[PDB]
Structure 1
Amino acid sequence: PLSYPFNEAVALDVDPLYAKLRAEEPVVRVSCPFGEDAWLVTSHADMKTILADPRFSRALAAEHDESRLTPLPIHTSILGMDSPDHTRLRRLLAKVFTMRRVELLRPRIEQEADRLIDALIAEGPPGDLMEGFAVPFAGTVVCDLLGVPFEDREQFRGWLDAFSATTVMTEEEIEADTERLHGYIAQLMVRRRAEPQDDLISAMVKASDEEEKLSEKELVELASVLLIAGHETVSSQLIDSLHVLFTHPEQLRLLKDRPELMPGTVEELMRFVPLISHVTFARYATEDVELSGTLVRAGESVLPAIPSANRDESVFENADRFDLTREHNPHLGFGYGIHRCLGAPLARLEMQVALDSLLRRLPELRCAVPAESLEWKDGMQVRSLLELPVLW
Structure 2
Amino acid sequence: PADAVPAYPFSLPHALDLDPHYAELRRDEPVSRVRLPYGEGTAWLVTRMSDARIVLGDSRFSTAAATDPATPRMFPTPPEPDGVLAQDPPDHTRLRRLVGKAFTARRVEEMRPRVRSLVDSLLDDMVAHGSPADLVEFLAVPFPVAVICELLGVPLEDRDLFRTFSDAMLSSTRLTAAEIQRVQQDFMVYMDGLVAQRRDAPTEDLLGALALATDNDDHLTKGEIVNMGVSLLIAGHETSVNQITNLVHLLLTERKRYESLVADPALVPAAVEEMLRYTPLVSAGSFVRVATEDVELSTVTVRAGEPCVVHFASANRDEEVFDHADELDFHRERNPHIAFGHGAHHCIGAQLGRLELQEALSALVRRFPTLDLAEPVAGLKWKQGMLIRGLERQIVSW
Q: TM-score range by the shorter chain?
A: over 0.9
| 1:186-234 residue CA offsets vs partner (Å, 9 max, x unmatched) | 1111112322222111023224523334222111101101011111011
Matched letter for residue 247 of structure 2: S
User: Residues of 2 paired with 1:251 and 1:125: CA distance?
Assistant: 22
- Is 1:31 equivalent to 2:35 in the alignment? yes
1:300-315 superposed matches below 5 A = 300-315=306-321
Q: Does 1:43 align with 2:48?
A: yes
Alpha-carbon offset, residue 260 of structure 1:
2.1
Inter-partner Cα distance in structure 2 for 1:197 and 1:264: 36
Query: Is residue 2:284 matched to residue 1:278?
Result: yes
Equivalent position of 2:93 in the other structure: 87
1:5–1:225 CA distance, 2 compared to 1 (3 A) = same
Q: For residue 57 of structure 1, what is the aligned residue in structure 2?
A: 62
Cα distance, 1:178–1:64 mapped onto 2, change above 3 Å: closer
Indicate which of 235, 245, 250 corresponds to 2:241. Answer: 235
Which residue does the alignment assign to 2:175?
169
Percent identity over paired residues: 47
Per the alignment, residue 354 of structure 2 pairs with: 348
Report matched runs for 1:136-151 at 5 Å: 136-151=142-157
Deviates more, 1:322-331 or 1:254-263: 254-263
SS in structure 2 opposite 1:92? Answer: coil
> Aligned to 2:301, what secondary structure does the other structure show?
strand
C-alpha displacement of 1:103? 2.4
State the distance in 1 between where 2:112 and 2:212 align: 24
2:21 corresponds to 1:17: yes
Determine whether 1:67 maps to 2:72.
yes
- Please say which of residues 193-202 and 50-59 is displaced more in the overlay: 193-202
TM-score by length of 2: 0.95
Residue 196 of structure 2 is aligned to residue 190 of structure 1: yes
SS at match of 2:191: helix
Specify the alignment match of 1:246 in structure 2: 252
The answer as to whether partners of 1:96 and 1:203 remain within 8 angstroms in 2 is no
Counterpart of 2:34 in 1: which secondary structure?
strand
Structure 1 stretch displaced more, 170-179 or 65-74: 65-74
Matches of 1:168 and 1:28, distance apart in 2:
26
RMSD of aligned Cα (Å)? 1.4
2:312 touches 2:338 (CA, 8 Å); kept in 1? yes
Between the aligned partners of 1:43 and 1:273, the Cα distance in structure 2 is 16
Distance between the aligned counterparts of 1:106 and 1:296, measured in 2? Answer: 44
Alpha-carbon separation, structure 2, partners of 1:138 and 1:10: 25
Task: Please say if residues 96 and 204 of structure 1, whose CA atoms lie closer than 8 Å, have aligned partners that are also in contact.
Answer: no
Deviation at 1:96, TM superposition (A): 4.2
Q: Is the 8 A contact 1:377 1:386 kept in 2?
A: yes
Aligned-partner SS, 1:29: strand
Distance in structure 2 (CA, Å) of the matches to 1:356 and 1:219: 35
1:385 aligned residue: 391
Amino acid at match of 1:307: A
Bigger mean CA offset, 88-97 vs 325-334: 88-97
Please state whether the residue corresponding to 2:215 is helix, strand or coil: helix
Does the 8 Å contact 2:68/2:78 carry over to 1? no
1:162 Cα offset (Å): 2.8
Q: Distance in 2 between matches of 1:322 and 1:165?
A: 29
Instruction: State the one-letter code of the partner of 1:148.
Output: V
Partner of 1:317: 323
Q: CA deviation at 1:362?
A: 1.5
Using the alignment, how far apart are the partners of 1:322 and 1:96 within structure 2? 32
Give, in angstroms, the shift of residue 332 of structure 1. Answer: 0.2
- Is the Cα contact below 8 Å between 1:97 and 1:200 reproduced in 2? no
Which stretches in structure 2 are left out of the alignment for 5+ residues? none
Question: Which residue of 203, 215, 236 maps to 1:209?
Answer: 215
